[PDB]
Amino acid sequence: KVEKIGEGTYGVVYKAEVVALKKIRAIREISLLKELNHPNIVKLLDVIHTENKLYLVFEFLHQDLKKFMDASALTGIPLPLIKSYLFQLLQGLAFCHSHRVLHRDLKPQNLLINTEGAIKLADFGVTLWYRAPEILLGCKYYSTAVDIWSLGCIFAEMVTRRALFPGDSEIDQLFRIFRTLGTPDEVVWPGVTSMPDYKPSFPKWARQDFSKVVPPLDEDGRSLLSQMLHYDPNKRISAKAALAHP
Amino acid sequence: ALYEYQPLQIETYGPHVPELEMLGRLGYLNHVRAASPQDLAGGYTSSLACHRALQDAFSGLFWQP
Amino acid sequence: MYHNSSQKRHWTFSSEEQLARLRADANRKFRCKAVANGDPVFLEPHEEMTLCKYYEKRLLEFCSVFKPAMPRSVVGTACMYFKRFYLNNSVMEYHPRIIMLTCAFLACKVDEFNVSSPQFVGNLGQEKALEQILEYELLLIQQLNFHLIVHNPYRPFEGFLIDLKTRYPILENPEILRKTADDFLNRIALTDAYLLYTPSQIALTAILSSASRAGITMESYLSESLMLCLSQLLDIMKSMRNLVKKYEPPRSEEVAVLKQKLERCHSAE
Amino acid sequence: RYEKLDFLGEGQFATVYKARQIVAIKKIKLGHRSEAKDGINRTALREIKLLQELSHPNIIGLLDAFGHKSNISLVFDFMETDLEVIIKDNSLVLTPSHIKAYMLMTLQGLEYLHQHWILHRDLKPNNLLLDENGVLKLADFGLAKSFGSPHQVVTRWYRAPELLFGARMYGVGVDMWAVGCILAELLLRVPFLPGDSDLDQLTRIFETLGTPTEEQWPDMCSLPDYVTFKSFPGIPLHHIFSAAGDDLLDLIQGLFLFNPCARITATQALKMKYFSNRPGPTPGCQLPRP
Ligand SMILES: Nc1ncnc2c1ncn2[C@@H]1O[C@H](COP(=O)(O)OP(=O)(O)O)[C@@H](O)[C@H]1O
Ligand SMILES: Nc1ncnc2c1ncn2[C@@H]1O[C@H](COP(=O)(O)OP(=O)(O)O)[C@@H](O)[C@H]1O
Ligand SMILES: [Mg+2]
Structure with a gap:
């Protein structure tokens, strides 16, 4: 092994062309990573099954997006770079949504970046900062708009160099979403009064313009972010539709 | 077999610390900052801070190595 | 509470004679190790004590201007860590310039003063210092006998x-x-x-x-x-x-010559 | 020094191995690449800094904390099982004496912890380990914080309503609510308030115990993450626990008071009538084992 990259909640990551080896003491991740062949996603090369431990082989990217913005907090990421990153992520998400698969865990820590300037999805199988109001309000339906909401949150964090909704708890997260995007009225979001975790005594916060929510973005970028940041899951812009966005 | 209560005995090696309940009548709490409604909602009182300060001030005063 | 803590049980000594004995024993151990590995460059225990107090003053100055807002309990814990470390160890084995930074880092971590490595090193070669603190953190923790709680007065x-x-x-x-x-x-x-x-x-x-x-x-x-x-x-x-x-505080010329001698020892070995 | 004997488990924070007196070595994980410049993990440091100042039979003890490079390994005593397995085991019967003994051990540990001004903050049935001699000990001190000087919270199933409403400053009331929830789980063999989210947890709490007014919780709107609720009548306590006595009902009512200041503490609870009644708590040797 070249070195030990680290270890998450499951498995140990090693570095060893340079590849990454994940050691697991499962089948769902292998099945989810074997059915798509896309250049904007981490590809599982080989699987080694041993009575000691299971080994998964992936391509090696030096760092992730979270460390990238941590190091570039003062330098500032130029607009073409973040635009290209967002478009690559949207292409990957559209390819994923073409198949019957859901990520639901889109955070900048889970996105990996290479030296050439390509960002690929990872971890196809605490995270309150990138949760959709549908999931927060106790809706069991897992649509494809949650990935778009998380991608919009990541995009806003990248452009503003700061998390859009840095809440600490689920209730505080929902409150921050309500302050930043107004109150989810029935006319704005049909069926909002039907989820188990909706209370009529919620504060009636008012909507504010995105000019103060995401200042440095352009009009087209603000419109795309607003379309991705929609209370109604049915009205959220799909990844395929987001790909064909000026 | 019945469990009989018995308070724990730990040597503070210092002057006797007044009881937490009595801190109201003895007048200690008049020499600190009044607790906010916010931390009073969660169960945090200035009596606890005064008791901790008094306990630490009298902790290990009559002790030698 | 102090009356049932490890600081009272292990880090409170009867008299300065025991402290002098421990410092002399540390200096003798370092000298024996150096002479076994294979003389004027060595420092007497009083020179070590003077250098330790000078670097404690340096740590005081460093924590005085540390950003963000630095509480006083964390500074007291850092200083007590410095004293405990250099009571049983020699100054020339580990350079105090980085040891005081390691003590400050450990005190900030232990005393719940939530700060990250970039913020800690921005108050000061920063990467080399960060690597040195990361390497020396476990050594400092082990030298403290895993007694990282300190009651300031x-x-x-x-x-x-x-x-x-x-x-x-x-x-x-x-x-x-x-x-x-x-x-x-x-x-x-x-x-x-x-x-x-x-x-x-x-x-x-x-x-x-x-x-x-x-x-x-x-x-x-x-x-x-x-x-x-x-x-x-x-x-x-x-x-x-x-x-x-x-x-009494050390004089400037003695501090300068002791610092030069310490640099000479650290560059020689 | 410590030959590894078996593998116990692996969590998000650390991995535990049973090693040889048989002990448990918990090795913290290096974490992600964004947590590589932080040296030793703050959870292990917190466990070391808080477990080296406490010596009680009902608190987990740090035998050793040897480490190498940036990896640190904590040595704890070996525990056969925990209280969660006892709750979820259908082969055994939880008599009132068993519940009394478990509550007594938990409350004695909590009293000793509160005397030294430490809040466990992570009280759960799986966090109350049981050794081979049937002695309950609190564990998982990675969230424990010292209180008394002017967002790491337990799971929603045992989170106190003050914590659910976002209380930054709190006393021993949160641990008291957690041990009350543990008592309810012991009695009913089921999660008393198994909410699906924070809002769902609050809804379940207010449906099972009634939404309190300002006369029972004097300070409500002061908390920042506070939401108003309907006036649910609340199921009577004796209806929920049909096999519980009147003294046990009073203890439960005190443990579940919506006012943290008025909520009984460990000292008040330990001298109550329920623990002094008949029969006495079960000795540790006769406690059930799966
Ligand atoms: N193929 C890879 N290339 C580069 N780095 C990787 C690769 N796979 C995993 N990593 C690194 O390993 C760390 C842990 O990843 P992961 O196992 O997905 O975390 P978790 O499973 O706990 O969410 C991440 O910080 C990531 O940077
Ligand atoms: N003293 C101990 N003896 C044996 N096993 C222990 C001990 N303390 C903790 N464990 C192990 O730790 C595991 C629980 O870890 P957990 O609390 O889920 O980690 P995290 O807090 O990171 O989620 C259990 O499976 C248990 O076997
Ligand atoms: Mg646990």
């Missing part, structure tokens, strides 16, 4: 101030005793009394010294309000005052 000082404001009506305004006693505390910081006496005793003698300087006697406080033993506590306070009085 500031909380007992505040408790004594509250009790004096409540139960002592002879003295009118306790605030006049806030400054001078605190100053005395700072002097006790430089002296080795942190490893000899309990924090409550330190706060008490600081308060009584401040009152004596102000001209107000407090024998009634000790005798009656504290139920007081009396002669023993008074002797402890007198020894504290003597320890503060006999302390």
Whole structure:
């Protein structure tokens, strides 16, 4: 092994062309990573099954997006770079949504970046900062708009160099979403009064313009972010539709 | 077999610390900052801070190595 | 609480003779190791003590201007870590310039002063310093015998101030005793009394010294309000005052020549 | 020094191995690449700094904390099982004496912890380990914080309503609510308030115990993450626990008071009538084992 990259909640990551080896003491991740062949996603090369431990082989990217913005907090990421990153992520998400698969865990820590300037999805199988109001309000339906909401949150964090909704708890997260995007009225979001975790005594916060929510973005970028940041899951812009966005 | 209560005995090696309940009548709490409604909602009182300060001030005063 | 903690059980010594014995033993161990590995460049224990106090002053200065807002309990814990580390170890084996930074980092982590490595190193070659602190953190933790809790006398000082404001009506305004006693505390910081006496005793003698300087006697406080033993506590306070009085700061030329000699030893080995 | 004997488990924070007196070595994980410049993990440091100052038979003890490079390994005593397995085991019967003994051990540990001004903050049935001699000990001190000087919270199933409403400053009330929830789980063999989210947890709490007014919780709107609720009548306590006595009902009512200041503490609870009644708590040797 070249070195030990680290270890998450499951498995140990090693570095060893340079590849990454994940050691697991499962089948769902292998099945989810074997059915798509896309250049904007981490590809599982080989699987080694041993009575000691299971080994998964992936391509090696030096760092992730979270460390990238941590190091570039003062330098500032130029607009073409973040635009290209967002478009690559949207292409990957559209390819994923073409198949019957859901990520639901889109955070900048889970996105990996290479030296050439390509960002690929990872971890196809605490995270309150990138949760959709549908999931927060106790809706069991897992649509494809949650990935778009998380991608919009990541995009806003990248452009503003700061998390859009840095809440600490689920209730505080929902409150921050309500302050930043107004109150989810029935006319704005049909069926909002039907989820188990909706209370009529919620504060009636008012909507504010995105000019103060995401200042440095352009009009087209603000419109795309607003379309991705929609209370109604049915009205959220799909990844395929987001790909064909000026 | 019945469990009989018995308070724990730990040597503070210092002057006797007044009881937490009595801190109201003895007048200690008049020499600190009044607790906010916010931390009073969660169960945090200035009596606890005064008791901790008094306990630490009298902790290990009559002790030698 | 202090009366059932490891600091009282292990890091409080009877007299300065034990401290001198431990420092001399550390210097002798380093000299024996160096002579076994295979002489004028060596430093006597008094030179080591002078350099340790100079670097403790340097750590005080560093924590004074540290950003963001740096509490005083964390600074006290860092200084106590420095003293505990260099009581049993020689100054030339590990350079104090990075050891004080490691102690500050460990104190910030332990005392719940949430700060990250970039913020810690921005207060200062920063990458090399970060690597050195990361390498030395485990060594510092092991040298402290995994006793990373330290009770500073500031909380007992505040408790004594509250009790004096409540139960002592002879003295009118306790605030006049806030400054001078605190100053005395700072002097006790430089002296080795942190490893000899309990924090409550330190706060008490600081308060009584401040009152004596102000001209107000407090024998009634000790005798009656504290139920007081009396002669023993008074002797402890007198020894504290003597320890503060006999302390002196090192001169500039001695510090410079000792620093040059230490750099020579560190570059030689 | 410590030969590894078996593998116990692996969590998000650390991995535990049973090693040889048989002990448990918990090795913290290096974490992600964004947590590589932080040296030793703050959870292990917190466990070390808080477990080296406490010595009680009902608190987990740090035998050793040897480490190498940036990896640190904590040595704890070996525990056969925990209280969660006892709750979820259908083969055994939880008599009132067993519940009394478990509550007594938990409350004695909590009293000793609160005397030294430490809040466990992570009280759960799986966090109350049981050794081979049937002695309950609190564990998982990675969230424990010292209180008394002017967002790491337990799971929603045992989170106190003050914590659910976002209380930054709190006393021993949160641990008291957690041990009350543990008592309810012991009695009913089921999660008393198994909410699906924070809002769902609050809804379940207010449906099972009734939404309190300002006369029972004097400070409500002061908390920042506070939401108003309907006036649910609340199921009577004796209806929920049909097999519980009147003294046990009073203890439960005190443990579940919506006012943290008025909520009974460990000292008040330990001297209550329920623990002094008949029969006495079960000795540790006779406690059930799966
Ligand atoms: N193929 C890879 N290339 C580069 N880095 C990787 C790769 N796979 C995993 N990593 C690194 O390993 C760390 C842990 O990843 P992961 O196992 O997905 O975390 P978790 O499973 O706990 O969410 C991440 O910080 C990531 O940077
Ligand atoms: N003293 C101990 N003896 C044996 N096993 C222990 C001990 N303390 C903890 N464990 C193990 O730790 C595991 C629980 O870890 P957990 O609390 O889920 O980690 P995290 O807090 O990171 O989620 C259990 O499976 C248990 O076997
Ligand atoms: Mg646990």
